[PDB]
């Protein structure tokens, strides 16, 4: 009804003023407009390739968009366009043409909405602007790991909820499965910190790698290191959770003391409020009536059981991005001892192609990680955000947390990255069978590549009790016993 009023002609003695978004530029025609004021800023979906974050940001429009804004004032008669930027910024910062949205997307997202429409053929589908065939094939594979697509490439129940989230599938995965044991306030805080960026100023940036100052840096890091010895993700949870109780007058003092970035943390505060609403809208039953309060954001320190579960939800998003220590898979392939520093301990990704020399596949810990100041041996299985070639010596690791054996299996159970062996028989390994399609038995799960598949590098997890039901001749697992 309101856009009926704008299209309704003005009263006599009154000049018309309309104020709107790009929709007024192109979507519709405004009769009688002789003056157009151009801010030059529009909010459009943006995908960040380096950190894989999808967001909606206010930024400069393309040169074509600005011209369409200026031609608006000249439909009925000669008019004037007043741009709130200069020619120089128009020449340099305004791109000639707006990029297609398909190029401003996660590739996993495009297939997700594409599959949410129940369209089978993604690889051969005639895009106006096709993404690379290789880019697509990875995207389908990533969603299958996220459980959004089943074995037959069809969207699953996780998938339909996955499409409803406007975020990237990786982050939307953790938010969906996190509605257990009141762990939602913690998980979004990670998502907010990860989505916006790292708020920790490291020693190298500080140039202190003065002897009193480096200690204060160490004390500040140690103060945020109580949640978990082996995890860097929860240290990010410490600052964001500790941020909220820092009153308004104590922001800057808190920030100078802790060597953190002010403008970054305030943003994270805003993302949490926005992020919760998206989750509580889809998850809750009164999707649109829900409203966020700062009190819901506020929460106390996680319990040890809650910490373990949080490690599970984080790994749920990053099942593919999980690394193993090399000695466990290949003993003596790389010499290791207690003398070797932690930063020099090799690790292997699960989907790393096996090269003739296994040393090439190795990845190593970043010095800034909490795992550096640790001393004793690091854990066998690591979860990481991504890999960075930075550092000429070795590839470095953006670690999140440490995941144990059985938790990793139950998380990969939904995904296709985990395979199960045949029923184990032997000492105390009788296979219980209730019906011809039903049985309860021990199985050693295999995570990663199949034993036949030598191209990729899979490994075997610890044996675990499990319930299986036979479906289409396949002994599908139901739950670990």
């Amino acid at each position: 009804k309101e856009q009926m009023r704008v299209f309704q002609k003005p009263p006599q003695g009154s000049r018309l003023c309309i104020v709107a978004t790009n929709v007024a530029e192109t979507s519709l025609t405004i009769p009688g407009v002789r003056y157009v004021v151009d801010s030059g800023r529009s909010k459009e979906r943006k995908y960040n390739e380096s950190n894989g974050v999808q967001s909606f940001e206010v930024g400069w429009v393309s040169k074509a968009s600005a011209n369409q804004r200026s031609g608006r004032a000249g439909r009925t008669g000669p008019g004037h366009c007043y741009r709130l930027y200069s020619s120089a910024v128009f020449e340099h910062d305004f791109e000639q043409f707006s990029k297609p949205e398909i190029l401003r997307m996660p590739v996993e997202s495009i297939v997700l909405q594409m599959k949410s429409m129940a369209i089978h053929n993604i690889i051969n589908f005639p895009f106006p602007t096709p993404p690379d065939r290789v880019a697509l094939s990875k995207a389908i594979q990533l969603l299958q790991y996220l459980g959004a697509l089943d074995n037959k490439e069809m969207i699953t129940e996780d998938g339909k909820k996955m499409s409803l989230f406007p975020l990237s599938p990786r982050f939307s995965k953790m938010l969906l499965v996190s509605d257990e044991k009141a762990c939602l306030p913690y998980i979004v805080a990670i998502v907010s910190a990860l989505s916006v960026g790292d708020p920790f100023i490291n020693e190298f940036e500080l140039g202190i790698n003065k002897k009193e100052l480096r200690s204060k840096f160490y004390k500040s890091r140690s103060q945020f290191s109580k949640l978990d010895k082996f995890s860097d993700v929860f240290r990010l949870l410490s600052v964001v959770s500790a941020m909220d109780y820092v009153p308004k007058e104590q922001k800057e003092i808190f920030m100078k003391k802790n060597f953190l970035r002010g403008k970054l943390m305030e943003e994270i505060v805003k993302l949490r409020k926005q992020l919760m609403y998206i989750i509580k809208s889809n998850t809750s039953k009164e999707n649109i009536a829900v409203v966020i309060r700062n009190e819901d954001l506020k929460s106390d320190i996680p319990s040890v059981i809650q910490i373990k579960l949080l490690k599970q939800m984080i790994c749920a998003g990053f099942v593919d991005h999980v690394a193993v220590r090399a000695d466990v898979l290949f003993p003596d392939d790389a010499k290791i001892t207690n003398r070797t520093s932690i930063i020099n301990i090799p690790y292997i990704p699960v989907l790393a192609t096996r090269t003739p020399n296994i040393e090439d596949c190795f990845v190593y810990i970043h010095p800034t990680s909490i795992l550096n100041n640790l001393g004793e041996m690091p854990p066998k299985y690591m979860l990481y955000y991504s890999l960075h070639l930075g550092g000429n010596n070795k590839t470095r690791m953006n670690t999140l947390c440490d995941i144990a054996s059985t938790p990793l299996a139950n998380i990969a159970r939904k995904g296709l990255l985990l395979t199960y062996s045949k029923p184990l028989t032997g000492q105390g390994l009788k296979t219980v069978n209730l019906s011809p399609t039903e049985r309860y038995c021990y199985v050693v799960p295999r995570f990663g590549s199949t034993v036949d598949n030598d191209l990729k590098i899979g490994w075997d997890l610890n044996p675990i009790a499990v319930h299986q039901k036979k479906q289409k001749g396949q002994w599908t697992v139901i739950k670990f016993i």
């Binding site: 103060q223 410490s238 959770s241 500790a242 109780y245 106390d300 320190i301």
Partner: peptide, 4 residues
């Protein structure tokens, strides 16, 4: 606080 516990976090601090």
């Amino acid at each position: 606080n516990p976090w601090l």
